[PDB]
Amino acid sequence: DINIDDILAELDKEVSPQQDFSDLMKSWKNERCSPELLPYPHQLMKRLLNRISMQSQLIENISMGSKLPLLCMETELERLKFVIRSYIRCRLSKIDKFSLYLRQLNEDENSLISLTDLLSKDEIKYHDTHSLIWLKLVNDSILKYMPEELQAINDTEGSVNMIDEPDWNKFVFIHVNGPPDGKWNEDPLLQENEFGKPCYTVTIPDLKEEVELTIGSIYVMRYEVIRDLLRDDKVALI
């Protein structure tokens, strides 16, 4: 019999502050779990901080001018500020642990990414000056007494490597979202399993093995194996 659902669809059809907070929640949750330091959202933070300032002035103006709407506005601003506070504290904690690694990544002239791409201006200031403070402390206290072959602080060639770096093979929990627009027919990686949902396929190279990541199922997976799909928002960390 004659289908018309498409005829009805074509007949029938004839950035926001809400979205930014969802992106902030996404960034916060991903930053907490992942082993590496993810790149800073430069644009989002500018817009959010401006909005916070304007809302604060509006609350003051209305206060100086029913109680309940003010209640809602005040506690909403508290809820918004808490997330940003937690997020920035986590990022600074990551910068403490990978300071020499980030410095070495910046000193490499052939690096595919610059340190200013990855970090915010405040983070750059913190990294630079904190490294000098720590360096002065150990340089005078310990290294002043060592012979010239052992006076380097970031030595790679010694019997133990003095530089730490992320564990790229850490296990993480994931939830498979698919492409964000619902465009299952457009995603080139998204093949299909038999009589069911679409899926992605990944190769785990130490074992020479494959797995199928169906939409909507949860997995415990190595970080490096799923890094590209995470960067493309095909999956989200639980």
């Binding site: 907490r32 809302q55 809602c72 909403e76 403490d96 296990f171 929990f173 130490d206 797995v211 997995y219």
Partner: protein
């Protein structure tokens, strides 16, 4: 800098905070439709356009904020009823490996609504408190069977709740990491 207990995981307070951003259905006892709310992380139209005893949808934290006072009443989710919970227990017993398809926030939302909104249910609350317990016990049996398959490569989970995952996270990931270290050391 960050506390030691927050290096790799979310505390239950953060889990409650995450769940509180979801929408929920309410009956208001006052009309706001013709100051205005002027929120910045949500829609603002719904709260500005309320009419008494007309059903509407808002975020859960504002819903609990209103229900603190006379001004509001909360409609329970449809899965949170005796008939549906009976069917889910039967599914759990019937399929001895699969987890039943409850929503990702079922434990958190049940233990919020039973405290803040004990008066707004239709079923007797002393039966719901029993059936929630039955579901959690059966799921714990199924979890204890699954921890015999920790391995060097991966694992699949389905319909396991957020709080249930967060409860187990530091054990699964640690033991799995050490099995990986032992295996790769023999390859190198």
């Amino acid at each position: 800098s960050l506390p030691a207990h927050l290096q790799q995981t979310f505390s239950p307070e953060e889990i409650q905070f995450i769940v509180e951003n979801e929408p929920i259905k309410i009956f208001p006892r006052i009309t706001t439709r013709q100051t205005r709310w002027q929120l910045i992380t949500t829609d603002d139209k719904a709260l500005n356009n309320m009419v008494a005893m007309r059903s509407t949808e808002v975020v859960l934290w504002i819903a609990l904020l209103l229900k603190q006072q006379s001004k509001c009443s909360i409609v329970a989710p449809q899965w949170l009823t005796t008939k549906e919970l009976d069917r889910k227990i039967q599914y759990e017993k019937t399929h001895p490996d699969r987890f039943s398809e409850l929503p990702w926030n079922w434990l958190v939302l049940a233990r919020i609504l039973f405290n803040k909104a004990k008066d707004d249910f239709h079923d007797p609350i002393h039966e719901l408190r029993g059936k929630i317990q039955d579901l959690r016990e059966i799921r714990q049996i199924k979890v204890l069977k699954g921890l015999k398959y920790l391995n060097e490569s991966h694992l699949q989970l389905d319909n396991l709740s957020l709080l249930e995952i967060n409860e187990l996270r530091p054990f699964i990931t640690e033991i799995m990491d050490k099995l990986r270290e032992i295996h790769t050391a023999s390859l190198t």
